[model samples]
Target: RETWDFLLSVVGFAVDLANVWRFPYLCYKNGGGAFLIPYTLFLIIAGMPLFYMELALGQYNREGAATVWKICPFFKGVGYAVILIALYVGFYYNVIIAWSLYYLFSSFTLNLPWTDCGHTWNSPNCTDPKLLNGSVLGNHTKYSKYKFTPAAEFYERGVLHLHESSGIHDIGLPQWQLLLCLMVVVIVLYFSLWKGVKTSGKVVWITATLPYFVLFVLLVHGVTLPGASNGINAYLHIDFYRLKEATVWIDAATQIFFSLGAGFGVLIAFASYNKFDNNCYRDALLTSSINCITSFVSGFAIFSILGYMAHEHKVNIEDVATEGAGLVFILYPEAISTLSGSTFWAVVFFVMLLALGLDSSMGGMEAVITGLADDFQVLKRHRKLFTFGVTFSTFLLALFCITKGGIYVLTLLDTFAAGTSILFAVLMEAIGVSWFYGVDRFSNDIQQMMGFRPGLYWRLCWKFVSPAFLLFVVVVSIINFKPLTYDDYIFPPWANWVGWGIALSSMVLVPIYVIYKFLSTQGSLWERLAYGITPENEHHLVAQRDIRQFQLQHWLAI
Candidate 1:
């Protein structure tokens, strides 16, 4: 029972806002069904092996990501790198949840405020889709230029009070509403996890499965509504030409990485609790397969609404498509408002979103907390105090995102934190494990755990295919990297410098730590290199018959 729930938590962790929130937009941006070609390829060659490696390492060691690196002490910064990425994401993930909570509370109101332009927050640019049916302004001429929905205007002027040009300098004060909702989220998370996996495992039974139900309900509702076919067609339409673009492949690979939770330490943390002989490879593959299926399904549900918006406005479907927070905060709410029982649908959707984000945040925070506790055993007795300290500190930092110009900061972090740093981190993980740690030994470790050896293909992937592809990704990502932009405004060079710093903050640690090990060691250069690369009895081997005696004794006692 514990093993099953633990697997579900990992699944819940991977199938998060990325699947619903990130993947849909990326698929549409890339080439619809065409993007799936590269997506599936990378999932097999790049993602699957890394996923299995983390699971085997954690289950064998029964240790957190940080402590598991005792196998190769010099590159241990890879573990710290993962934790830093988690902290970067952990602070903002709940802010996204708070946004949903704010919307969830508003869903109970009559008339759904986002549906109309009568609100004070709405600007002159705001237009209702319903008013566009038969007018010239509603047709190609008006939308081909630029048109704003009431929802976008509300999200900007009403919620953010955003200025047009300023960057972080424009971030003045935090929004009280988001702060209050953030407090609620923190309280709920504290109770869910303060007791650790013992408590979190029970909660995953609900949190893991709720979003699929909500998505199914919304899909049925969305496809039956007027103008539904337009949305469905617009979404399923394939663009074969996009495969020629490097950018398309970049997007596909990054989406796959994000959807699988590859670069983050959450997988290692979750699997660390698994029984020694669990089928770690099978679970990673199965979970990743289901996650992709869900992403494809949710695209239809979401685009159907966007298609309807375009049909009503007499505009191109492309004009109405959006990405990131805009898709949910603006477009999704706008679509739901047009339906019967708008408030009910709104609450259902946001609640589902809250559940999705909550699981991801749980996995991430658990990685950070568990890593710290494992590294410093004294902190094990003080888990609650440490968890509180981490959570409260995150809350304080998240306040920057609630400010008017904080969207700029969020946009910058969202792009660079995972986009830039994760590729580097994942590439390092492949190099560290496959090159230094040794694949033959890793496969032997898995055989010990599972009672069978991994096939030649698994070994081949770790040694060659995975690293080759990842190195290509890193190189192309840098050669093609573009400056940061927020809608109509381009960030100044100084702001971009900060964004690069965000990526480097985690990435630079590997070289720094590696050099520290080489310089500080009391030996010749060759000896230091050998010492840094070699294992130190971290993976203790025990005979199967020895474990059989314990199993027999335990059953006899029972």
Candidate 2:
């Protein structure tokens, strides 16, 4: 049996950073707390069902998710495509993790320079000569005379502009730091993947478990702050009108997929390592429950801090902050810096971000490595080298995103890949696994691997509910498609085209390749390959029985 602790750790690692750091804020901003209504709905109808389906498939097949799909053979390309997308995601995602690492290290210092009032903060005093560093006039003010208190300083600076004027735009990083950090990210990924499950399990234990302590610290500190309750109220108070918009549903679905790591092949890849008789139904429910609770709790911690900021600035919480990088990087830092002994708190917060980010990054890399191993048999024996190759390849590709134009590219990919592609993939996957392969057989295999039959509720979810939800997301996404824009910064037409190109390269290319392979082979090559690989009589014996009959018997026997 797989260790409960290890499975729990992996699930926690997958669910934490993506939700805690990003999703709660996303929901609040998108629908002003009403987002949770549809979000909770999607979590049940889309996220959990799909998650359960993927994990069941992985454990039943005793193979990676990609390989598991080959049971249909015709849709094997779909499986390959998911793997490729996971790799592409892993490549660019590490850049964000590197940013977190940079921030984490900065926490140890007395003050984070990025949190200083400057052009990046969009503060009124940013351009003031009196506040400019080193000017005699600038040095004359009480602003200059005030001791740098980490909390108050960061609060004044805001969390969004933590690295303002650092010249690290989406296009790329400073050449040296970019290269160095990229190397660091790749090296860490390589080490995590080198020993495969054993090493990765241990890494998850540290990265996954440590962040909870940091989160608890922040929660306690934030709640005790004089004005924190207001922010928390803003975060939680439902804005019922926002729920009427279609966009709210979209955001809810996106958050559900993003937070749970659902439809992305991560859960399936991890589940592949499970023992033959593991109880994945229970595991799936447990993981989903934990993930939901984490998101809820994180909202309290995040909003409480924002409340304090609103109190201090004499402004509404919404007026002072935003949902994305602004909230985590600029606004929160500014808020924390205003607190007593702000420096210490700032460091702690960033450290929490880093630890959470690191664990998730590792999980993402593990998915990529597992995908590579499943696609190519050559990778099976030299797993370490295979992982290194995947890491190096992803690192190089990710650098494209670090360039001045890279952020635009990342934005485009993020839109398509983040939840859209995964949702579509899940739709296709559910069809393949349920209809094409036969749901009864699939469930029987799951029963054998999981040690109990899935109940009527699960069957209905797999057969009807999950695919229907994904179809809704796909239709909405296409109908409501908006052209790409930079983070409030306009980009040239050519730059926008580059973004589209990168997205289509992965999203479109893989399916086209699958169609090509299917037309070319027409089952002939597979038959020949099977014949060559097997003893002639044994192959003939297998071929004599209808494939459907054999599959049916397998299911019945199980």
Candidate 3:
């Protein structure tokens, strides 16, 4: 039971939509196989260490992100910060799931709606991928001017209807179609999650497993397509020179960090349920390696189709490759449309997407539910009602994302809600555990549960290297940050401020809670500082002498 619960929950969280679209896109952009150099480096030093740390933290404490701060009451805000980011993510993340559901329901027809142009949604700009060369391609029209595929038009006009809104400022009313889809997603999430891990544990037997089957099947079919080799070649091409760029390393850092699904409180929440003696060390290495390997394999599934698209269009592979929603919703569907038995493939593909989406959505929602519920006993006592309230509130907030200009809102949330802010949350968590709580004590806790202490490498990572890695990435992420842009519409400065506000809203909680804890403690300055840094269980040891955390040996324990 423990193995099944931990296995699926961790896998579902780590292997997400990002594995499908984002990682491959990053690989293509950042020198293909060479990108793995920094990626694997970061995965070992930063990703796996933090991954192991959170699992150990949760498994030992058996507490959620918020209440787990009993080790250091001052950094309790780090718990709140991560929990808030998890909540903020649901505001836009689940909208993607709704979009997947919409596409799924739309796939029930004998003819896929995106298969051809000339529909009401298709514009004069829409050109058939098959007819792109020679006939209408004498260069009278610039390639960019008349290059919209029917699938692209369907996604923009038929699905999002982006033409109706000028920009973020003009975000109009919610579309009834998307509202229905969003409601279904919410209802599914509510029921799957309202009972906590038990219900979700069973649900993952499908949501987590279906994507792997579909990904494998799609990969086989994709490789057999005309341009499959070309896409795979491009995806695998190694450009060692690209590693010189700071952005390449930053992308690797951010991608691996986010892709591993750390820092959201989800890992902590999921791991907290494991058997105390479970070897989470093995679980960490096993699951993280699988997640990264899956990301690599999913690229073949993606690029093979992209190769076919580029081959069909008679364009360079670079011309056809893109990322994010476009890769999955537009390009993949467009490629599927040209296949034999297109409708069946379309249904299969979207079902895969829905499963990928729903699994990740469950993890995030669980993080928020578990994080808060563990903190507040009232919430724990009334889990069902609390769960409903959380889902409903997320749905109500998500209504903005379903608006006519909702894509713009969703884009902003995607960028700001958890972007750099989550890195900051994890940075705080590392400091709280390794610095304040002390890595020696942390390793001792792990030893108590697992019957062995972590090796020096893991201890040093949690103590020094991992924190430095996180701080470096956080600094670079902010330095390289650009204003939000979707397509041709650049976000206004005021809108960027609002986006930053969304990011800072959660980040600010970390410091705010520090000050609150310091002022509220009943003592002199040093005593308050001592009380804040000391664990709740070790307060009795505080007045005896300066705590171990205050000693130089604690800092140099490893």
Candidate 4:
């Protein structure tokens, strides 16, 4: 693929739905404008460095995530771990895409179904938001707790049918409509990825670009609304004192990693398609920076609507502000339904979400498709069939997420599948590349591809700072971890065990392979260690015997 194609593809991967729903809420929650300080700091010290490393590694080796670990064969498991992480993520991730697709389809009506309480799905207590007023409402949100909005009812009773099941243990039959949407989503992913980068690269030109137009349009419309200024004030209001909480830094660190889309192997897969001479250093900086900037701007678009919601409800912005699916599917759609040209706005908003979902979904599937196909040449020969199998399998596994209690299933997967496990995989990846494979040689590989070596700042960040940063986040993530809960329901202890198994299943591959490699090799203890740690290209070096990876000079060189 050409440089422009690579740029669009990778940028499309990094800038995703989380930029809209998740980041803005995180910014608002973690001290508003002050959240950006730690966020930007994490981006520089950890996020960008790992991003650069993955791109350079893929560009230089022209290999997928799994095979790129040929540099240090022992940590090849980390590659596999991340690839599996992406796959696990795809299970529920595509369900989210399907949710947006369903919303897109629902948006076509003249009167949005969510706009009123007259629908069959509405309970007796359902309250049309149109009637919300100072006199009608109770203190702050107390009145809201007892009465559901039409939008809320549409989400819980109509779209999800979440009322059908009590909890995860009571999951009922799949919702056929959502299943169909999931099928459509998988089909789109298959076609986009079946031809690899050539197809996805072209697809992203539209999928990646359309969200920006919609976001800009939405922002303009939002700012013109009565409460737009108030919402923006709430969003941008500096609360430096909130930074004193450890959760603020933790949220910033995790948000930076998740937002930038590193450690998913998608970056490595996309860069693997780039020409050897591609300026990946510049691409890494440009794409990651754009992703962060898009995140910041999306906050304006989101909070403007939120501001409008707060004003219309005669409530505080905090009462209306929510995160994730609730914010997008319920709150924002409710806000859109209240607008002039309501149908048109609903259509436009869901389209933006669908575009974001498709582009991000494409990246995850591509990571698995490319990572496996490259590692196994037989699969490469049957790329079309392999792509079908991957998409189909994810669709099949996602069936649970389309069930009556699918939201519960989706919540479990979201919390565990890619959360802590991805951080662990990235941490191992950093150690493998910088310490085990040797940063001196890795930099030389970058020098060969990019015409110059990374400076000391980049090198230090990659070797010391990035690993430490990842380690801290991973540790904190575990320490601060709470039992998985969705709304009022707490997951059973057994469910928590199941969730941990899903996470550790990928993580255990690293050490499992380490011991497997150690025992499987034919040599003494020292020879086995040396053989396992040596780069595949340097087998001859081992045969000639310097054990450069073991030398203090290799460790000290960077």
Candidate 5:
């Protein structure tokens, strides 16, 4: 039962919002059919291997990833840093959950305030004249005069707000509604996490499993639509010319990491709960395979709808296949509105999104709470307060994100927090386990835990291939750093520097603390120097001899 529960949680977290909303669009935009070439390549070289390594580390230590590094003593801070980044990530991610909930609730009404197109087939016109009473105007609002179309209008207005230079500041949400939705998200999260894993285990039944059902429903509904086939063709038909661009590979790598939850410590936290005897080798393979399949299958559902839209508009699929929230909030909604029983379809899509996002948010929260319990043992005894503390702290921290400048802050934090910092931490973790901790012992522990040893392919992956691939991606990504631009907006060079600083902190801070601890220890300088002079072979012999003597003396005393 415990193993099943743990596996469910892993599945719940792994197959999340990114898979549903982000991956399909990214695949279409970057290389379409060609994107899969690099995506599949990275899955083997980068994704699966790192995933297995993290699971091994967690199961080996039989502790949360944060405290698991204590085996090395010097790398304990790296674990703590992972937890910190996870917590920081959780704080802001919940805000996105709140936004999704708000959208979900808005779907029930006969009229959507954002839909303003007067076109022939448009859904019920947004009749709330006061909807913009105090709301910031954006480029999306330009489409307010026409019937909703699943095109660039929604992307421009709802998300990028290209008409307004200030982005989030210029975008307005109904204040009371936003607050109420935020409260609901916080309450739901607090209750879900209050009892820790026991409650979370059951919650996964709804949060994780239900989204796939929703996706299946939408896929079935979408494929039957008239123009759906054209969208699928466009989505699947790769432009070989675009595959030559380096950005194609980078985008594929980024999507794999983001969608698969590779670098983030959520996988580590999830694996930490496994029984020492659990079969994680099979479990890891199963999880990665299922996630990859979902990404591939979801593309069919998304592109079918886009094909329908493209056929209707007599435009290229590229015109409709945009990125970010606009793909869902604006374009998809517009397309769905054109179908018979459009409202029903819209509700289904949003419901699927809500379910997907809930699982993702919960996993992130678990990472933060688990870290607290692991690092500060005091919290373990008072799980309720610990849960509340983590929830409250994250909520407060996220308020800064709701402000006028919050989107910029969110972008900066995301770029550094999980995107870069977490990747660096994963690199450190790989080195720590493979080098400092014995690789053979690591493999043996996994074998013992799972009741079967991994083969040469798995061993090679953990020991060498994984780290090399990560280093190559990191180096190449840095050297070819083209500043990320959304619409017409370009981030300044300082923003990139800021992102790097945040990422490097996790890498740098813990090592510094370890050095400090070594210096502050009680050993005399001469004794420490003598100990350091001991050869590598002599150190293991001495350690074994000391262990034997201590055991003998204890038995004699008994």
Candidate 6:
């Protein structure tokens, strides 16, 4: 791949809907400006250093995420864990794209569909306090007997076709429109990614560029409107006491994790294609800086409108604030309705979202496909057919997510599939490289590839600072763990256990494979382990000649 292609790919991978959809909400949830303190701290200590490490790993090893682990055979499970991350992401993340596409198509009319209070899917409690009194509320909000945003109601009712009593059990038949939209997204993603970096590099040319335009345009529009400053003020207002809360730190770490695409292996996957000597160190710094800046930039656009909504409804901005799909699908749309040329702005906004989603989903889908193809050479030749099969299978699995209860499934998968497992995966990745592979040796490899050695600062971070910070984050994450909830509906105890099971299921590969290699070796147990954990002189291209090396077990092998 060309250098610009690689840079854009990294940026595309790094800057996803999570930047827009997840970060601002997390900021508001975690005490506004106080959140940025931990966020920027982790971004520097954990995120930036790891971003540089993964790229250097791929560029130096000439390997994707899984095969990259040949640097330390003991941690081969980390490689497989990345593949599992890719699969979990590929399956559940597309459901977000499908949801975005639903809104994208819905935006085509002169009036955006979600703006109305008169849809069949709308609940009897579909609320507009202004509509109730037939005039806007005063600057202060007064409550009715019940409270809900029309946007939230539209989402809960019209979009998801969800019942008020909905939980996992109420999951009824598949919602056909969502299934169809899901199919469209999967098919587009497959073709967008089918030929690998060469194809996706070109796709990012447009997909990578347009979102920023929309973002800044929205920022200009959002920051200028009435109540915009209030929203911006709420966003900027810091609560130092929030720093004392464990969840705030946990959220800041999670936001940085997702924002930087740390554990997904997509970064490693993209970097694998770079020329052996390309300056990945430069690329890593460039992309991660842009990613975090965009997160901050997007909050202005998102929250200013949120403030307007709060003022428009004569309520607190907290009433207008939401996260995940609700922020994009509900709250933002709620804000857009009051603007002139609302349909035009809505279409532009959803298109921006689609670009963000496609870029992120493509990065994830490509990572999985690349890792599998690297492990199994034959699949590399028949790339088109292989991706088609993989895409269809993923779609079939995601069909469950498009059903009436699919939001619940998506929520669980979102929380567990990557969320719970990612920190451990990242910790393993950091330790695998720094402790096992040896940071000094890895730095020497970088020097060989890039014509210069890392300085004292980079060395300190790679060896001690990054890994120590990750360990701290993981410990605090476990201590601060909370059950997943959708709106006011806390997931059942049984369901929370299942979510953790999904998380553990992803990370179990490391210990399992390590034990297997230990048992299969010839020696005393400690000797076998010593041999098992030792780094191998394995390089993929060194052994393959278009060699017939196709199997999952090959990937599993230490």
- Candidate of highest lDDT: 3
Off by over 4 Å in 3: 1-10, 25-31, 131-135, 138-147, 240-242
What tens-digit string does per-residue lDDT give for candidate 6 at 233-289?
977888889888777877887788888777887888877877787887777787778
Model 4 per-residue lDDT at 97: 81
1-558 per-residue lDDT for model 1 (tens digits)? 134244553456455888777777677556466677778778888878877777788888787878887777776888889888888887678888888888887788887777767677777666666664334553446433233667777777766667442666678878788889889988887777677656464446656677777778778878887878987876677777876667777777777777777777887788787788788877887777787678777778777877777776666776664554456677678667765788888887888788777888877888888888888987788888888888889888888877767777777777777776787887888777766766666778888999898888887788789888888888887888777665456788888888888889999989998998788876667556656766656322221122221233422221
Which residue runs does candidate 2 get wrong by more than 4 Å? 1-5, 8-10, 114-124, 127-175, 200-202, 331-348, 403-407, 485-487, 490-501, 509-514, 522-558
Candidate 2 lDDT over residue span 1-558, tens digit each: 232235553366344566765675576566446876787788787778778888788777666656776566555656766666676667567766666565666577785665445434344433221144443432433422121323333432332222333222343343455557668877876786687556455545555666666567667778888887786777678887787656678777877777777655677777777676777677778777877777776777777876775565444566545444324565456556656777777776666665566666666666666666777777778988877777888887877655544544555556555655666676788876776566677778877775677777777777778778778777887677555443344555665456555545655744685566556643576564433223223545447643443344533332
Steric clash count of candidate 1 = 0
Report residue 284 deviation for candidate 6 (angstroms). Answer: 1.5
lDDT of 3 by residue, 1-558 (tens): 132233643456556877775676666556567777888888989989999999889888888889899989999999988888878878987888888788988799987888777789777776776545434543454333123667767887888887798888998888898999999999988888776556454445665677677677778778889998888887778777777656677768767766777878888887787778888888898778888788778776777877887776666666554443455686678667766888888888787777767777787888888888778877877888988999899999999998888988887876688678888888989988988888888889989998999999998899889889889878987787777666356899999899999999999998899999988989798888889989899898878866887788877767
Number of backbone collisions per candidate: 0, 34, 0, 0, 6, 0
Task: For candidate 5, write residues 162-219 as lDDT tens digits.
Answer: 3344654343433344456667877787888787566454455555566677668667
What's the TM-score of every candidate structure? 0.90, 0.81, 0.93, 0.93, 0.81, 0.90
Reference-based lDDT, each prediction: 0.74, 0.62, 0.79, 0.78, 0.63, 0.74
What's model 6's lDDT at 38?
Answer: 87
| Alpha carbon lDDT at 457, candidate 1 | 86
* Model with the higher TM-score, candidate 2 or 4: 4
Local error of candidate 3 at residue 465 (angstroms): 1.9
Better of 1 and 5 by TM-score: 1
Worst-scoring 10-residue span by lDDT in model 1: 540-549
Model 5 lDDT, residue 355, Cα: 62
